[PDB]
């Protein structure tokens, strides 16, 4: 529905979706490659 | 911040234990625990249920500064209208009381003004700040070295 699409596109939903995307990226990277103090 | 850094570094220098500051100042919990918590052991024991030593006056001034610092908060947070209405009620109480109506004020009691309230809160705040830090510093250094 158009109203549902408009609600999903509001500021809090976008900000939280982007934050979870970034957090998932960082968490997965830190899981598969932890303890990166510098480019060795 | 300046005085905390200077004092902790010089405590390490004078005691010869520079490594403690060197490895504990990189994180804030070391500041909280190794500097504040550790160096208050002798200050707050100036007067005990057991007796009194020469640091008793400094402990009293330490608590005194904490108290004045706290007191400034209510000139800084609570504002005028509340106290104005409270003083209105007190004025009613005085004017309606027998044997106290024989005594009357010359200047009508009012609450402190906004700018005066900010100034008084800042004054109590600064006095408490200075007294608390001075008491803590003197007591800690005197107990450690003096």
């Amino acid at each position: 529905m158009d109203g549902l699409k408009s609600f999903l596109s509001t500021a809090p939903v976008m900000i939280m979706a982007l934050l979870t995307f970034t957090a998932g990226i960082l968490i997965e990277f830190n899981r598969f490659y932890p303890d990166l103090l510098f480019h060795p | 911040w300046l005085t905390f850094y200077w004092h902790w570094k010089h405590l390490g220098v004078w005691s010869g234990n520079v490594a403690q500051f060197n490895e504990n100042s990189t994180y804030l919990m070391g500041w909280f625990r190794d500097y504040l918590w550790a160096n208050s052991a002798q200050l707050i024991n100036g007067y005990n249920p057991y007796g009194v030593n020469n640091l008793s006056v400094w402990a009293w001034m330490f608590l005194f500064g904490h108290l004045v610092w706290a007191t400034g908060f209510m000139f800084l947070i609570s504002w005028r209208g509340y106290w104005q209405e409270l003083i209105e009620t007190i004025v009613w109480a005085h004017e309606r009381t027998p044997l106290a109506n024989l005594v009357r004020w010359k200047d009508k009691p009012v609450a402190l003004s906004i700018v005066q309230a900010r100034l008084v809160g800042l004054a109590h705040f600064t006095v408490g700040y200075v007294l608390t830090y001075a008491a803590f510093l003197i007591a800690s250094t005197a107990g450690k070295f003096g």
Partner: protein, 740 residues
Amino acid sequence: AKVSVDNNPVPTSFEKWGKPGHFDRTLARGPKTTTWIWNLHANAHDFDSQTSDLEDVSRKIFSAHFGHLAVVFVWLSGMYFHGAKFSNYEGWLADPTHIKPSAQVVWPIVGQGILNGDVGGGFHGIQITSGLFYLWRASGFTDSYQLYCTAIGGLVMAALMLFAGWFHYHVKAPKLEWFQNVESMMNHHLAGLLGLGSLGWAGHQIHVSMPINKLLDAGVAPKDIPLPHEFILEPSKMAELYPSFAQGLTPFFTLNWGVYSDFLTFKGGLNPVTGGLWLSDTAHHHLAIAVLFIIAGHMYRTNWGIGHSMKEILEAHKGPFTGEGHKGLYEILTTSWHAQLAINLALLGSLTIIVAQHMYAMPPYPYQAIDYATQLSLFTHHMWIGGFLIVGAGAHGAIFMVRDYDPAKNVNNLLDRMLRHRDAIISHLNWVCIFLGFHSFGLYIHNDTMRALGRPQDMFSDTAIQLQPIFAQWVQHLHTLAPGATAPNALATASYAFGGETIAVAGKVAMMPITLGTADFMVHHIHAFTIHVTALILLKGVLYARSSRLVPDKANLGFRFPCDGPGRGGTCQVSGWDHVFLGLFWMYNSLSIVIFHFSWKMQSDVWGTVSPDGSVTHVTLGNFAQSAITINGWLRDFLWAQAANVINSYGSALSAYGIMFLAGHFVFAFSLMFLFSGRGYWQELIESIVWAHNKLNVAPAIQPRALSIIQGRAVGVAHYLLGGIVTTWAFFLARSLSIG
């Protein structure tokens, strides 16, 4: 039938989801400044201001309450699921005295797997302090499958609550007359909810909880104990455990109730094996209150002319000093939701305060008294909940006074008389607050100065000038003698706090007499001072919300306004909302002192370890009596001494608490940005920053604005309370988990 509804009043559509701010006329137009955002999140759930029709407001309230019920159901189902899947409840059940409860497991990602400490039995996880394990053991839980089924049922109930809200608003909305059947509502909610709930719980306990707990306390392994339905299916086991069950239900209908004495007792005290209350005592208790509540029902006239009328009772209780008496209150409490909210919030907050103060003295759950962390956590948590609810009552009462109070319907009634001698009330209350604070806190400061000056014989202590609480000691003596003398059929005292023997389980004191001395006198009167001051602030907010000698028209200005202006010398913080904002801090202060007193007294005079000989060694020894009389004692022997476990928590499983401890000390300080400053400075700073962003042609269309004065105060108080409470929470949890 008194049911009256309207069919499909509001269509179910998604369009309004795409237009935030639809409820408000001032916000649905579209944002021009950032304030439009903050208003949107602030005026959302204020249905009274949105519309003038009372019926629509009531419908919205009904469905919103359905929504909160659904949320609470989801929370309960989550608790049960996380106790069923990620907990050692089955392990703890076999060895309750050697395994710490734990129901939260932490993923190892960035080293937080260190939080998964060793809780015993080979299980690694976060220790819980809610006491859910003891509640589940008392409820008869023995397997994780039952907990999983409970979680599934909770999720189903949450979905049903959501559907109920949708149906009873968007489809079949009740009429206003339906909501105002206060007699019918009170009857159904006293007899059908409290009485029926108590009867159902008594039935569950008698037919499920007592047999399982009796077998568990004897020494039977959890897996050997029969499943709860097997007791009902084969009553031979029930008759074996309790002989009177062989008699069946015949004595109940013939009033030969005494035969049921074996499983319906009046023992009183604590169960030696578990340290909790006897389940037979609880069974007769909940049965008795069920009977009492069902009898308390059938009291208000609903449909058959047989019953009392609330309006008649209210208008009949009037006297000489009170003019019209309780007249017009029925119309107040049947036309304004805010007055009902105020009364219910005050009573409920006091109720949770009573819960906190009574659940620790007579611990109802098995193995709860010996888990000091759970005791402290439960006490403090429900204490804070009660304080917040009381402040909310003080707020929403002023809201009612500003909005729903009408002078036409209140002439010479109790409300008007209250509004007439409000100056006398406030003046006398202010005087009593000053007197209490002066004399009590001056006893404290006087003791401090006497100790600092080397004159301990001039202090206010048990060795020095006594100041003994003779009345509290007398009532403790009376309650200690009550079994046999004034309650002949009781076997032991209501609690061992008043007096008696020392009940200790697993070499840990569960409950021993709590002696009151000079320090207890001082602290209890300090509590009285703080409570009277908070009451003074909230009462001044409620009474003076309409007007005052300074501003005679505050009612027209609204309930939430920052000031009237810099005139009249300065009129800052005159609204009722400002009185709530000021009372929040004093509630925090009073409750902090209360929880500090509870923690220190519990650690110093009750909790501890009992030797095989019988000697009791307390957590902090007997230092409360000789240290809690000076502020220096409170600072050194309570904060500095007991904060060691939270400052030395780094590198261990408790490290999180330590982190959170510092977190609190941060946010509190952060709040001082908003409380100490004003918005013009920030507006000018935002002007400069807006110029900066404009130079690069990146200025936002939604013009940024500094927070409003009211918003600034609200943000300051919120972050302040959050920081302080989080600090206290971390400190208490670390200390209580580090004292065995």
